[PDB]
Structures are given as C-alpha cells and as structure tokens.
Symmetry: C7
C-alpha cells in the first residue's frame, strides 16, 4: 500500500544519509 511505500522511501533516504556520513569520514581521512 501507499503508506508502506512511503515508509520504504523514508528507509531509502536514511540509507542515503548513512552514505553521506561515510563520505564525511572518508573526506576527513583525505
């Protein structure tokens, strides 16, 4: 349903946040 689909979109966006945090860690190390 549409509520579950929207919640999956939230989960996808949170994974994008995780990735961006990894890019911060990598950037600091460089």
């Amino acid at each position: 349903g549409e509520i579950a689909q929207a919640l999956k979109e939230i989960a996808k966006a949170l994974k994008e946040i995780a990735w961006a945090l990894k890019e911060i860690a990598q950037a600091y190390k460089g």
Copy 2:
C-alpha cells in the same frame, strides 16, 4: 492519501539532510 503524502515529505526532507552532509564532506575535502 494525506498520510502517505506527509510521509513522502519526510523522505524528501531526509534527502535534504543527506545533501547537507555531502556539503560537510566537500568542506572537509577543501
């Protein structure tokens, strides 16, 4: 529905957080 729409707005805001984190990564690289 309005609940699914509001959840999609939460997903969009989380994407904005990810992009802001990328700006921090880019700042650390400079």
Copy 3:
C-alpha cells in the same frame, strides 16, 4: 487531519536539521 499535520511538522523539523548541517559546512569553510 491531525496525524498528517503532525507528520508535516516532522518534515519541517528535518528541513531545520538540514539547514543546521549546511551551517556546519559553512562554519568549517570559514
């Protein structure tokens, strides 16, 4: 309805977090 409105308030608060992250990036850059 009140649930959808409250979810929109969460989305707004998340946009505030994105802005504060942009402030961190700017502060690091000088």
Copy 4:
C-alpha cells in the same frame, strides 16, 4: 489524539537536534 501528540513530541525533539547542530557550527566558528 495521543498519536498526533506523540508525533508533535517527535517534531519538537528534531528541533532540539537542529539547535544542537547549530551549537556545533558555533563551536567550529570559535
């Protein structure tokens, strides 16, 4: 409703996170 009230408490806590992030930006300045 109690669900909408609890969602509002989530939004208030997210604004606290935004403010704490602004404090990190102020620390970086500084």
Copy 5:
C-alpha cells in the same frame, strides 16, 4: 495506547541524540 507510547520512546531517543550532539560541541570547544 502502545503506538503512542512507542512514538514517545522515539521522541525520548531523539532528545538523547540532541544531548550527544551537545557533547560533540563541548568536546570541540575543549
């Protein structure tokens, strides 16, 4: 209700995140 109670626990956890971000700000200033 149990859903409202769980949502309150999420708000409490978000306040702990704000406090931890305070700790980062204070640690950077030290």
Copy 6:
C-alpha cells in the same frame, strides 16, 4: 502489536545513533 514493536526497534536504533555520536565526542576529547 507488530507496529508498536517496530516503532520500539526504531527507538532502539536511535539510541545507537546517540551512542555513536558520544563516540565522536570522545574522539575530539
């Protein structure tokens, strides 16, 4: 109640985020 249980899992995951932020503060210290 599976929805309530999953929301409790969200709260637990958020507490893990708070702990990881304390680890960042400890790195600065």
Copy 7:
C-alpha cells in the same frame, strides 16, 4: 504486515547511520 516490515527497514537504516557515525569517530581519532 507491510507497514511493520517497512518500519523495520527504517530501524535497519538507522543502525546503518549509527555505523557510519562510528566511521567518522574513527576518522577524527586517526
């Protein structure tokens, strides 16, 4: 149900954020 499953996906994505923040802590220490 699918709503509960999507909420569990959100919890998993939050754990990924915690892991990424630990990568930042390790970077700051090094």
